[PDB]
């Protein structure tokens, strides 16, 4: 096929759903060194690769972003940009495009979830798992409480099976 | 009203995180080491280098330290050497793939 | 070896007298700021410009530092905000005379 | 050329830090040193004993100058400072490389002496008796340089 299922990709996301060291130290190798030595701090991006690295749908070693590895020798994009590109790359169109999303709007349907928007000097959104409710994480759509200077302009969501 | 990191070039891009990671280095707050690893983190995000490019320039950073640098008064001059040592001849080949 | 301030721009050597006394203004430590300042003394010396654009430019930090730079770290972001200062718009008139 | 006496007795008044320099001169000299814009005395201790003895700075000199409390003019960068001591004196009485006191003996007046190792200054500017200097001569084998190296030594002598 193309996509992970739901349930797999959740379940993935809950074993590295923990701080960016405990992120370090369960993947380890270069993601490790990496995460050890304070050059990687955000790992929203690791973790998305972690999710598709242990549901069957690796990412590539000469897909054109840029990775690092990790002990299990699979691949790891550490730019929040190159894994919202990799998702448009690698999956296809996505199943929906909201502008200023909340989480009304992506109602009734599962998946891979990108919030993009300006606020966050070091990244330009957030990249997560939205169960038809809430997000695996924090969604960052309209008024989530965990914004902080974020403002989400557009929500975009690939429907995982 | 301030620029977004975008507008830089890939080259004042990996200067800046350079810079910032050097003042990290010489910082004693842990408050000022945080906030400079995290300034650097985002010069990280925007650059488009592999990661062991910044290794290594961790590396040459940690170097270029021990040089001391003076002037015509006490102080240690820190914060300006690492000015300098993210225009330096040593980091210079780092900013190329 | 470190880069001489004279091999930088007057462009470049203002940015960075502003940069490093940012960071001054910024420290929680007395010798970081003793040494922020030194540095910054460093940059005036060798720039073309009237000490009365640096006293304005000086004006201009103190202002800029109230904005707030976040990010996904819950840090105040000062390094980085800096840095974005030193290349502002409001800072960019005060390059010249 | 102001003479020797005068220049040395006025130096004495601003031989300290430069905070204190700064409270001493005051106006918009004060003003940068509150400030800590200016930080290295050097030339406006120049500038001061220049200033007290009959050869004060030109308004419209062409080099960056800013005022004291009393009114007169203060060079506040020692290139700067450096350049003035030519153009206003002309030619030195004496230029010598790899400078040390022993290249002096014998003669009073103002000396400079350039070299590298200091980021914020090409060299020093200060008065020398023909054995000691008014603060410290930072010439070879002077064992608090640091990192400068002096590479030449000129003095212009003061009667």
């Known amino acids: 096929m193309n996509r992970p299922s739901f349930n797999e990709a959740w379940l993935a996301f809950r074993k590295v759903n923990h701080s960016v060291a405990d992120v370090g130290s369960i993947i380890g190798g270069n993601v490790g060194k990496n995460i050890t030595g304070g050059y990687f701090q955000n790992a929203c991006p690791i973790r998305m690769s972690y999710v598709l690295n242990a549901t069957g749908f690796p990412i590539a070693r000469n897909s054109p972003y840029a990775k690092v590895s990790g002990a299990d020798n699979k691949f790891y994009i550490y730019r929040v940009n190159d894994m919202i590109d990799y998702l448009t790359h690698t999956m296809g169109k996505p199943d929906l495009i909201v502008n200023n999303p909340k989480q009304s709007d992506f109602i009734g349907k599962k998946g891979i979830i990108v919030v993009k928007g300006h606020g966050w000097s070091n990244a330009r959104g957030h990249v997560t798992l939205w169960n038809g409710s809430i997000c695996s994480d924090q969604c960052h759509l309209l008024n989530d409480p965990d914004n902080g200077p974020f403002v989400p302009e557009v929500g975009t969501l690939w429907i995982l099976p | ?97």
């Open chain 2, 1 to 97: 009203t301030l620029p977004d990191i975008s507008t830089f070039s890939q080259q004042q891009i990996f200067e800046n995180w350079v810079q910032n990671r050097c003042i990290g280095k010489i910082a004693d707050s842990k408050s000022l080491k945080e906030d400079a690893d995290a300034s650097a983190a985002a010069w990280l995000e925007a650059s488009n280098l592999p990661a062991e490019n910044f290794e290594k320039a961790d590396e040459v950073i940690v170097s270029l330290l021990k040089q001391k640098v003076g002037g015509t008064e006490p102080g240690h001059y820190q914060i300006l050497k690492c000015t300098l040592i993210a225009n330096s001849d040593a980091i210079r080949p780092l900013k190329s793939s």
